[PDB]
C-alpha cells in the first residue's frame, strides 16, 4: 500500500518482555508484536525462543507494503538479543545497519535500591 521498502526496526529486549515494532522512516508506528500476544504462559513471554516467534508474527502483517531492508536498532539488555536478527534476515529483509542505537546515560537520577536477595 504505502511501499515502505525500508522499515526501521525497533526492538526493546527487556528481561520481562521483547517488543518488535516496524516503524516508518519518520519512526511512526505501523505494526508490532511481542511473545505475550503470541501467547505462552506469563513468564515464557521473554525467553530467546519466544523472541524468535515474536519477530516473525510481527513480520507477517506489514508484508502488504513490501519491505526489503532493515535498520536494526537494538535496545535494552534482556534476552533474545540475536534471536530476532535471524528471523529478520530469513524473511526477505536485509541488514544494512552498521551501528545501532541503545540509550546509555551520562547519569542523572537514582536507580532503585533493589532486592537484598
Amino acid at each position: 500500500r504505502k511501499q515502505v521498502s525500508d522499515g526501521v526496526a525497533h526492538i526493546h529486549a527487556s528481561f520481562n518482555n521483547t517488543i518488535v515494532t516496524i516503524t516508518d522512516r519518520q519512526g511512526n508506528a505501523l505494526g508490532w508484536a511481542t511473545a505475550g500476544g503470541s501467547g505462552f504462559r506469563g513468564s515464557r513471554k521473554s525467553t530467546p525462543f519466544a523472541a524468535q516467534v515474536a519477530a516473525e508474527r510481527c513480520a507477517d502483517a506489514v508484508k502488504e507494503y513490501g519491505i526489503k531492508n532493515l535498520e536494526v536498532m537494538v535496545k535494552g539488555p534482556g534476552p533474545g538479543r540475536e534471536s530476532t536478527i535471524r528471523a529478520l534476515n530469513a524473511a526477505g529483509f536485509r541488514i544494512t545497519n552498521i551501528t545501532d542505537v541503545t540509550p546509555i546515560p551520562h547519569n542523572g537520577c537514582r536507580p532503585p535500591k533493589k532486592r537484598r536477595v
Partner: peptide
C-alpha cells in the same frame, strides 16, 4: 558477559 554497571545499584 554483562553490561549494565552504571544502570544498576
Amino acid at each position: 558477559g554483562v553490561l549494565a554497571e552504571v544502570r544498576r545499584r
